[PDB]
Design a protein around this ligand. Structure first.
Ligand code: HEM
Ligand code: HEM
Lengths: 448, 448
């Protein structure tokens, strides 16, 4: 009835608790102490962090709760606009882009993106084949090169050529710095350079994306990318297409929402695999049995069943988009004891949800991909790495196809060594990643 | 060049349908021949469609319109120009369609809810009153439920099927009329007894329905049933009401189109639940959490999300109205390789469509309600248990609200045992049902 709350700081209430370098991990420790729900107050803001499947299964009732833009998403909106991830459900452009973009993100549409994904994945494999002895791999750095390039190619047929670079393409530098400024605004006349740099980074992103859209319309060429689908698609409901400004925001959104979540997933999966050599061996055995051709086919990726469980278990422990926000559509009572008023906000703390011992058992911290043999045995709403309902991740099939393809090829082509006995250190941006995770790869000498 | 199954001399393909399980026979042929095969008989040519690729074109209403299959033409002899057995271009179709659409909407189910509960409570009470190690004949009791529910919701008439071993004479004549209609497909001076009985059964249906209509008009009483709506409704287009003869045909149509499709759905769903105990446990948890009152409310039924998923996945594997028919409005080319002339007929083999691995993946034979967790993931025209377009099932919301309500109460009030390890055996009439499916129910002793 009375809702737990962590320690306060006078007038600032709970807010200084998030003035820390690892706020998600800080919130998980608070959840460890306070339980399934706690109130978090700041000046002009109240939200409630949910950690149990019991309460989150109610929060996922779309007749009772809708997606809220967290403060993070509101700051990302300044450059993602009314793209899918930073628009309200009630904004006309959300349902429009949702209806238009859903068929180009289907499992069936991944057949058409597969060749481009293979293109970047082969570049990653070739980079590792070309390392000299006792050189090593910087895992999140290379995974981020892979996912950024893959989304650039599948999104708007543009090659960032990240594997030809130390310093990323200017668009990426601006995007990364823009996200950083957005995240720095949370824990926040000396900011004049930050704002000037922020407007400057927005213009870099807008200019490049608007140019490619204009170039594509001028040329009239048709590609197998999201940009072509968006130039030609019409919303069945309104009968309208997306305008060029929103198409730009969707492209920027794909790059923001997709690249770091997906690269963090690959990075966490490889980390858990090298820390669990029996699991790695099982995944590598599947990769060798299934990937019989020099280039994986779309059909073979779907056959990487255990690799898929590996990725789901990595998403269980470290969901790389670690929270989402909801608001009550009407007055309602949560869990039979917490009354909420219309508009009241909730935060779903996904990594805590995925450690609910009433759901997963006492070994919640162990990496066991076998937990995902049967999705029917998993209770409703216990596993939410891609969000919920009509506001769930539209790029889920994309991300899992990319991650399964790349992890499969990595496991086919290399043995991995945790040569530093790497100590897990999770860096927090808007996503989570194992900072400083490094491995050595010894090639199995299998040609491409 | 179009594939075709084996022939029988002058009879061509027709004897292939001289079997007790013709839908399942056609599914096996589709397994061998692929997405389309020609089926020839004396004076008849049709083509059976099984792939989403081709059916999504057949469902283009600018190119194809609903055709009356030979089954529907035989049903028309007692369903008249009711909605299901009338051509789109017949005045009475659009007329009745316009009048009846508002009384079948989701909003209209609020008015039928009390009557549906009345019969559902009778079903629960019957099972609460079984003795130990007595058992349930599932499709038999489901059919008692759906017939009585349609009788009460349709024209405020109580068949009182739960007070009977031998059904009300109207039901006996109706079932025998449908049996004669289906037996005519597979079909001599010896058939003289058959038509005399058919005409007797037609008269039985007409007399009872005409009497109830006449009684209601004489009384002037108003009920929450479809009959009241039809005596008072006026088509906005023609400004006309339905006449008494057509009102009769609609009532007969609701009983034909609704009762065994819906009871087969309930029966198949319970079969899959007892065969998939993890699914049953998840559905039973939702039912216990949602149905907190002794009588389910309309709002609570809408909250049975996973029960709805169970029903959709049961409809995916065994769509109980297993086909519908179309004709080309003009000369057209199907799939880029099959030219069709004006008037050419197509049959949509729904159970095959629902097994199209290009849409659903390789696990098409597994019962996994989680496929329907997010309705956004289903491609267009991949899932068509209720037909297509303006000729789709008008009773879809009725059927799903009834099935959700009843299954929810069944799962709330009883644990179920597959005490015979029942082996699926699908009986085919105009619809599909699991013949001989029996269970034991152990009450949870929750009062009504
Ligand atoms: C492992 C990788 C990924 C994870 C964990 C992930 C996670 C999520 C989550 C949790 C949400 C819901 C956020 C909210 O409710 O506020 C979301 C939404 C979204 N994601 Fe992903 N994502 C991943 C990959 C991708 C990719 C590759 C793309 C694009 C190609 C993408 C595009 C989107 C979009 C557009 C939305 C908003 C959809 C809408 O609201 O209509 N994501 N994602
Ligand atoms: C699970 C249960 C049901 C299923 C699977 C089902 C399926 C279908 C299908 C596939 C059609 C299209 C047939 C064609 O195109 O030739 C149809 C039409 C129709 N159904 Fe249903 N049905 C169900 C329940 C009901 C109920 C409960 C009612 C009445 C209360 C009903 C009344 C009708 C009517 C009137 C039509 C013809 C509509 C028109 O053409 O204007 N059905 N149904």
């Amino acid at each position: 009835k009375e809702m737990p709350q962590p320690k306060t700081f006078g007038e600032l209430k709970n807010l200084p608790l998030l003035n820390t370098d690892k706020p998600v991990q800080a919130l998980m420790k608070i959840a460890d102490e306070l339980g399934e729900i706690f109130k978090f107050e700041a000046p002009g803001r109240v939200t409630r962090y949910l950690s149990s499947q019991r309460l989150i299964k109610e929060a996922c009732d779309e007749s009772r709760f809708d997606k809220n833009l967290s403060q993070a998403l509101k700051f990302v909106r300044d450059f993602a606009g009314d793209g899918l991830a930073t628009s309200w459900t009630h904004e006309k452009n959300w349902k429009k882009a949702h209806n238009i973009l859903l068929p180009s993100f289907s499992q069936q549409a991944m057949k058409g993106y597969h060749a481009m994904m293979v293109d970047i994945a082969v570049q990653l494999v070739q980079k590792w084949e070309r390392l000299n002895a006792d050189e090593h791999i910087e895992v999140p750095e290379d995974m981020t090169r892979l996912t950024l390039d893959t989304i650039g190619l599948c999104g708007f047929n543009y090659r960032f050529n990240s594997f030809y670079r130390d310093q990323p393409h200017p668009f990426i530098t601006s995007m990364v710095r823009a996200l950083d400024e957005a995240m720095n605004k949370l824990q926040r006349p000396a900011y004049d350079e930050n704002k000037r740099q922020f407007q400057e980074d927005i213009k870099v992103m807008n200019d490049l994306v608007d140019k490619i859209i204009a170039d594509r319309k001028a040329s009239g060429e048709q590609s197998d990318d999201l940009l072509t689908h968006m130039l030609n698609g019409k919303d069945p409901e309104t009968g309208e297409p997306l305008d060029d400004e929103n198409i730009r925001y969707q492209i920027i959104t794909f790059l923001i929402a997709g690249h770091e979540t997906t690269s963090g997933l690959l990075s966490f999966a490889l980390y858990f695999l090298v820390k669990n050599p029996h699991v790695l061996q099982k995944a590598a055995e599947e990769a060798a049995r299934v990937l019989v051709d020099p280039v994986p086919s779309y059909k073979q990726v779907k056959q990487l069943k255990y690799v898929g469980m590996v990725l789901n278990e990595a998403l269980r422990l470290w969901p790389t988009a670690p929270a989402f926000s909801l608001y009550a559509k009407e007055d309602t009572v949560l869990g039979g004891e917490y009354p909420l008023e219309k508009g009241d906000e909730l935060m779903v703390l996904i990594p805590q949800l995925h450690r609910d011992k009433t759901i997963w058992g006492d070994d919640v911290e162990e990496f066991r991909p076998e937990r995902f043999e049967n999705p029917s045995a998993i209770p409703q709403h216990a596993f939410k790495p891609f969000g919920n309902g009509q506001r769930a991740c539209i790029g889920q099939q994309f991300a899992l196809h990319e991650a399964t393809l790349v992890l499969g090829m990595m496991l086919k082509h290399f043995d991995f060594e945790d040569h530093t006995n790497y100590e897990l250190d999770i860096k927090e941006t808007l996503t989570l990643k194992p900072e400083g995770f490094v491995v050595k790869a010894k090639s199995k000498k299998i040609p491409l």
